[PDB]
Design a protein around this ligand. Structure first.
Ligand SMILES: CCn1cc(C(=O)NCc2ccc(F)cc2)cn1
Length: 149
């Protein structure tokens, strides 16, 4: 699968992160990201996808070595960490045709794993509207500890 790039945008307090909600298969909440184009550098893909989905341009803020990367079923997703973006920033996607909504979420309130169904004696995980964000939350929490305190 083709790598994806995007961003974890945080506010000035470092409390909140910016998530986007799509439609249909992409109906839950996730960090803004998308598929790399042929010959496109990871940093340009991230900025491009973030600008398409949020209307916010990260290019002046990207730091080359500040990202979290996960390989999930053989697909690499790398989210550059972009702290310090004011909470009153006005975000608007390129088309409401892909992005339903854009919101800040408290990091401490977001799940960092899904819950099983052990009270129901059933295998697997309960649905969670943050399932695409979830795999980045523990690594982000740890990364913020190691770079801010
Ligand atoms: C198909 C599995 N899945 C992906 C998402 C996801 O990426 N959510 C956030 C998002 C939505 C639309 C975007 F264009 C970009 C990012 C949710 N479920």
């Amino acid at each position: 699968g083709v790598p994806t790039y995007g961003a974890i945008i945080l506010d000035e307090t470092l409390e909140n992160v910016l998530l986007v909600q799509g439609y249909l298969a992409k109906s839950g909440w996730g960090f803004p990201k998308g598929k790399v184009n042929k010959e496109e550098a990871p940093h340009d893909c991230a900025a491009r996808e973030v600008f398409e989905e949020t209307g916010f341009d990260i290019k002046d803020y990207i730091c080359k070595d500040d990202y979290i990367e996960l390989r999930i079923n053989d697909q690499l997703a790398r989210l550059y960490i972009i702290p310090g973006i004011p909470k009153d920033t006005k975000f608007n996607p390129k088309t409401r045709r892909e992005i339903r909504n854009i919101e800040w979420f408290s990091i401490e309130k977001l799940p960092c794993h899904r819950n099983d169904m052990t009270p129901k004696s059933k295998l697997g995980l309960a649905p969670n509207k943050f399932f695409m964000a979830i795999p980045f939350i523990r690594p982000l929490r740890d990364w913020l500890s190691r770079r801010f305190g």
